[PDB]
Write a protein that holds these residues in place. Sequence first.
Motif, PDB file in Angstrom:
ATOM      1  N   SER A 141      -5.948   5.058  -5.283  1.00 11.59           N
ATOM      2  CA  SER A 141      -5.764   3.944  -4.354  1.00 11.59           C
ATOM      3  C   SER A 141      -6.164   4.296  -2.930  1.00 11.59           C
ATOM      4  O   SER A 141      -6.306   3.376  -2.110  1.00 11.59           O
ATOM      5  N   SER A 193       0.843  -1.177   0.000  1.00 15.83           N
ATOM      6  CA  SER A 193       0.000   0.000   0.000  1.00 15.83           C
ATOM      7  C   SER A 193       0.886   1.237   0.000  1.00 15.83           C
ATOM      8  O   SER A 193       2.072   1.174   0.335  1.00 15.83           O
ATOM      9  N   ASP A 197      -4.023   0.350  -0.912  1.00 16.57           N
ATOM     10  CA  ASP A 197      -3.573  -0.928  -1.451  1.00 16.57           C
ATOM     11  C   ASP A 197      -3.432  -0.848  -2.966  1.00 16.57           C
ATOM     12  O   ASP A 197      -4.351  -0.406  -3.663  1.00 16.57           O
ATOM     13  N   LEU A 198      -2.277  -1.279  -3.469  1.00 13.67           N
ATOM     14  CA  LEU A 198      -2.032  -1.396  -4.898  1.00 13.67           C
ATOM     15  C   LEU A 198      -2.073  -2.832  -5.393  1.00 13.67           C
ATOM     16  O   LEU A 198      -1.925  -3.055  -6.594  1.00 13.67           O
TER      17      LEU A 198
END
Length: 146
Positions: free
Chosen positions: A98, A41, A104-105
């Motif tokens: 995001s 993240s 979170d990616l």
Amino acid sequence: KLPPGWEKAMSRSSGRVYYFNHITNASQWERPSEPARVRCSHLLVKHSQSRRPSSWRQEKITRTKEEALELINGYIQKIKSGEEDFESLASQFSDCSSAKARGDLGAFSRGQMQKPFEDASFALRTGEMSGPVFTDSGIHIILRTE
């Protein structure tokens, strides 16, 4: 000893030794403890010289590169003191969509993200947090979750 990127340094204020990581910009008093994918993240603070100076938070981002770094530094202070959670600051203040997913990616491999982001992300261990990480997007705080 010392894992990748970590070196020992001398505290200017206190004279005690501390540890710094030149890949993640992490720094801590404590002596620190490659996968194909990691999950991270982030919290992004954009500025006037960002590759694209706009976000869901404000149409025209006008803050300087220096003011963005001060904001990042303050969020790191809040996270490290436990006054605020990473996820809560990312959701409220990150200049990236995001933010809606607590920063979170998802998972990624090397060769997908901007290179400084990738290098910091893969030099973190699971659960660790970066210092300021600079890309053309802006300045990030990165949390490795997997």
